[PDB]
Amino acid sequence: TQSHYGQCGGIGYSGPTVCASGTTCQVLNPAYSQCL
């Protein structure tokens, strides 16, 4: 899984798109899905 503060999604986003537990794959803005 992806670590705390590591980016998860948003801007048609590739790479480690699956967060660690406790933290959420966020939706702060359309581009900004992060592990918070």
Q: Is the dihedral of CA 22, 24, 25, 28 positive or negative?
A: negative
3-class DSSP state of 33: strand
Q: Apex CA 21: angle with CA 18 and CA 24, to 5°?
A: 65
Structural domain containing residue 30: 1-36
> What does the alpha-carbon distance between residue 22 and residue 14 come to, in Å, rounded to a whole number?
22
Method: NMR
DSSP secondary-structure letter at 20?
P
> What does the alpha-carbon distance between residue 18 and residue 15 come to, in Å, rounded to a whole number?
9
Encoding tokens for residue 19? 């967060």
Residue 9, Cβ neighbours under 10 Å: how many? 21
Residue type at position 19: C
User: What is the domain count for the chain?
Assistant: 1
Return the residue matching tokens 């581009």. 31
